[PDB]
Design a protein around this ligand. Structure first.
Ligand SMILES: [Zn+2]
Lengths: 254, 92
């Protein structure tokens, strides 16, 4: 326990929509602090798995991470109180062209994801599923990472999976690197589907044959080399988020 | 009810625009009459009644037309400009 929150202090305001695991509702805890309430649908996730999921997400905090404020276990459904991100899902934020994003702004989003991923890298934490779908954006435009570790609980992200995860199902720190590369493409292609013309079965086969995502019209040669370095056939030659952020900040001042 | 106690009066709302940017093409007198006060960050203004935040102020803007388009449920807005106005702005 010790992270349990009394829902008597919570005040619901707007239903943000239904997603994975449950419904997300915007509220105000103690009448002044903005909170996001994830209502875990009865029997959607494993009860025993909800023990490890919460515990690992609690003792983890970063500037660019969606902070978990706690749980509400003493009632059904079980609530997950977290940091409220106004703009919601990054994928929808990118897909809305009513923002008119600049190349410098899209590169700043990549910096935000990389900064958070470097923290999970040091903590030996694997996201096991990194994409725009599992990334949130606040009112200020800052992109943060969420739904981490949740892949091992409760179709498969084939398009974000490296060759070793496809052919042999071997998860490493370099598996998230490949996923970050496909996410870097998602940002520069503005919420476009990776390998759109190919089905999930064709995607797995073509990745093994050496097919890599094309350079989007927005990304320059330098930025495309950053996302391409993530897509090395041999995982040993893929960089780290420390090396990736270094290249991101170097190109930022170029 | 009211969101911010300190900014109930126009004279109090105007005091926040002390370090408001002289770059923005929106006059503070217009914002303060529309229940807005400067937050302190670039062009961020909140409402004292509905806590309605508004930024990225462009030229040819009306703080009342922006108050109705984004926050029609604002009790101060319906009190000042009237429901007939609020419904007309939200009607488009
Ligand atoms: Zn208002």
């Amino acid at each position: 326990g010790s992270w349990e929150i009394d829902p008597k202090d919570l005040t619901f305001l707007k239903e943000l929509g239904t997603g994975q695991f449950g419904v997300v509702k915007y509220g105000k805890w103690r009448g002044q602090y903005d909170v996001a309430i994830k209502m875990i649908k009865e029997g959607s996730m494993s009860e025993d798995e909800f023990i490890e999921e919460a515990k690992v997400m609690m003792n983890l905090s970063h500037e660019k991470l969606v902070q978990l404020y706690g749980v509400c276990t003493k009632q059904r459904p079980i609530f997950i109180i977290t940091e409220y991100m106004a703009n919601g899902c990054l994928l929808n934020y990118l897909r809305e062209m009513r923002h008119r994003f600049q190349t410098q702004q899209l590169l700043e989003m990549c910096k935000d994801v990389c900064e958070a991923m470097e923290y999970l890298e040091s903590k030996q934490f694997l996201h096991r599923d990194l994409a725009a779908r599992n990334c949130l954006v606040n009112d200020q435009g800052v992109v943060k990472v969420s739904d981490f570790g949740l892949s091992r609980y409760v179709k498969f992200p084939v398009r974000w999976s490296p060759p070793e995860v496809l052919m042999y199902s071997k998860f490493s720190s370099k598996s998230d690197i490949w996923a970050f590369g496909v996410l870097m493409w998602e940002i520069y292609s503005l919420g476009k589907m990776p390998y759109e013309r190919f089905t999930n079965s064709e995607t797995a086969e073509h990745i093994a044959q050496g097919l890599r995502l094309y350079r989007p019209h927005l990304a320059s040669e330098k930025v495309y080399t950053i996302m391409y370095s993530c897509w090395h056939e041999k995982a040993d030659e893929r960089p780290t988020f420390k090396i990736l952020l270094s290249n991101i900040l170097d190109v930022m001042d170029e | 009810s009211i969101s911010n106690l300190s900014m109930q009066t126009h004279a109090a709302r105007m005091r926040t625009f002390m370090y408001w940017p002289s770059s923005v093409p929106v006059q503070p007198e217009q914002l303060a009459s529309a229940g807005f006060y400067y937050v302190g960050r670039n062009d961020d203004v909140k409402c004292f009644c509905c806590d309605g935040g508004l930024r990225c102020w462009e030229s040819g803007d009306d703080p009342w037309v922006e108050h109705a388009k984004w926050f029609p449920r604002c009790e101060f807005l319906i009190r000042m400009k009237g429901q007939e106005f609020v419904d007309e702005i939200q009607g488009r």
